[PDB]
C-alpha cells in the first residue's frame, strides 16, 4: 500500500503557489513528477545539510517518512507509471551524464539505477558542442518530438548533468465534437480578448461547485485511468483558488464520481513552459545545493562539484480529441 503521493501534490502546490505570487497575468505550467524525481534521484548522492534542504524542501519531511519509502516509494511510482495500457500513453525516463570512468561512488551508481532505473551516459564535457545536443537528443526521443532542444548553453567546466523526460497522450473517453467546436472569444482580462477554437459539449459531467475552493471543478477523464481536473474560480474570486488548493480537498474530488448533466465549453490549448529553478527552488528552501556547502559526497568522491542551475520544461495540448502533454528537467553540476 505505497504512496508518498500526497507529499508530491503539496509540492505541486508549494511550488505553483509560488509562481502565482510572482506574476498574475502569465500562463503557469510545470510538472511535479518530472522535477521532484530529479532532486530525489540527486538525493541518493546528497548528504547532510544539503540532502536535508533539498528534501523536506519539497514537503517530503524527514522526521515523518524514512528515506527508504521516499525512495522505494518512487521506484514503484515510476515503475508502475512507465508501464501503462493501450488507450493511454504515460512514459517517463531518467538519465544522468558524467565523464567516463568517473569518480562515481560505487554505492550511488547502483541506487539511482535500481531505485529509478536511470541511465548512465558518460558525456565528454570538453567540447560542449557535443554535450548540449546529445543530451537534448535523448528527451526528444521520448517526448516523441515534443522537446528536441531542452538545452542551449552549459558550462564547459560542468562536472555533471542530470536529466529526465516525460511524455503523455490521453484521450477523453467522452470526446468533444470537432464540429460543435465554435470560434469564440476568450475573455482574457478586463479589456483584452483573443480568439480561440472553443470546444463544446452538453450532457452529464462530474463538474461540481464547492465553497472552500470556490470554483467549478470539472474532472473529465481518459482511456487508461487518468483524470484532468479543471478549476473555475469565481468572478474575481481567483486568488482564492490558487491559495486554496490542497491535497486534502482534491483527494475528496477524485472520489466524487456523482454526475449532473450540464453544458461545457473548453477552448483548444497549446502553451509552453520554461524556467530556471535556480531561484524558485531556493525561495522554496533549496539554495543549500546551490551554495558553498555542496555536499555531493554520494554523487562523487573525486572533487566537490555543485548545483549550477535548474532547467525545467513542459508542453500541454487540449482539443476535442484529448490531451497530449510532455515535459522535462535538466541539472548541472560544476566544481568549487
Amino acid at each position: 500500500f505505497n504512496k508518498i503521493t500526497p507529499n508530491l501534490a503539496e509540492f505541486a502546490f508549494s511550488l505553483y503557489r509560488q509562481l502565482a505570487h510572482q506574476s498574475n497575468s502569465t500562463n503557469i505550467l510545470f510538472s511535479p513528477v518530472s522535477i521532484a524525481a530529479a532532486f530525489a534521484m540527486l538525493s541518493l548522492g546528497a548528504k547532510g545539510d544539503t540532502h536535508d534542504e533539498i528534501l523536506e524542501g519539497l514537503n517530503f519531511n524527514l522526521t515523518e517518512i524514512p528515506e527508504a519509502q521516499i525512495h522505494e516509494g518512487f521506484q514503484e511510482l515510476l515503475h508502475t507509471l512507465n508501464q501503462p495500457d493501450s488507450q493511454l500513453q504515460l512514459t517517463t525516463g531518467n538519465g544522468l551524464f558524467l565523464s567516463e570512468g568517473l569518480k562515481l561512488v560505487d554505492k550511488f551508481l547502483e541506487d539511482v539505477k535500481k531505485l529509478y532505473h536511470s541511465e548512465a551516459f558518460t558525456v565528454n564535457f570538453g567540447d560542449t558542442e557535443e554535450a548540449k545536443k546529445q543530451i537534448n537528443d535523448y528527451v526528444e526521443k521520448g517526448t516523441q518530438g515534443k522537446i528536441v532542444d531542452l538545452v542551449k548553453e552549459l558550462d564547459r567546466d560542468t562536472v555533471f548533468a542530470l536529466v529526465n523526460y516525460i511524455f503523455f497522450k490521453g484521450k477523453w473517453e467522452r470526446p468533444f465534437e470537432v464540429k460543435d467546436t465554435e470560434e469564440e472569444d476568450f475573455h482574457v482580462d478586463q479589456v483584452t480578448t483573443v480568439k480561440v477554437p472553443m470546444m463544446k459539449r452538453l450532457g452529464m459531467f462530474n463538474i461540481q461547485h464547492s465553497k472552500k475552493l470556490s470554483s467549478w471543478v470539472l474532472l473529465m477523464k481518459y482511456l487508461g485511468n487518468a483524470t484532468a481536473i479543471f478549476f473555475l474560480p469565481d468572478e474575481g474570486k481567483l486568488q482564492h483558488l490558487e491559495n486554496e488548493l490542497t491535497h486534502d480537498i482534491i483527494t475528496k474530488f477524485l472520489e466524487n464520481e456523482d454526475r449532473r448533466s450540464a453544458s461545457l465549453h473548453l477552448p483548444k490549448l497549446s502553451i509552453t513552459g520554461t524556467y530556471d529553478l535556480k531561484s524558485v527552488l531556493g525561495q522554496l528552501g533549496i539554495t543549500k545545493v546551490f551554495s558553498n556547502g555542496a555536499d555531493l559526497s554520494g554523487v562523487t568522491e573525486e572533487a566537490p562539484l555543485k548545483l549550477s542551475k535548474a532547467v525545467h520544461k513542459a508542453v500541454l495540448t487540449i482539443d476535442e480529441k484529448g490531451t497530449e502533454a510532455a515535459g522535462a528537467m535538466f541539472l548541472e553540476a560544476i566544481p568549487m
Binding site: N27, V33, H187, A228, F230, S263
Partner: peptide
C-alpha cells in the same frame, strides 16, 4: 448548469493508479 471555461483558471492532469500529479498549470491569456 450552464458552465463555460473562457477566462484564466487552473487545470491539473492526474494518474489514477498512482494518484500522481503528472502536470499542472493555469491558463490565463491563450
Amino acid at each position: 448548469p450552464e458552465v463555460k471555461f473562457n477566462k484564466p483558471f487552473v487545470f491539473l492532469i492526474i494518474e489514477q493508479n498512482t494518484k500522481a500529479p503528472l502536470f499542472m498549470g493555469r491558463v490565463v491569456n491563450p
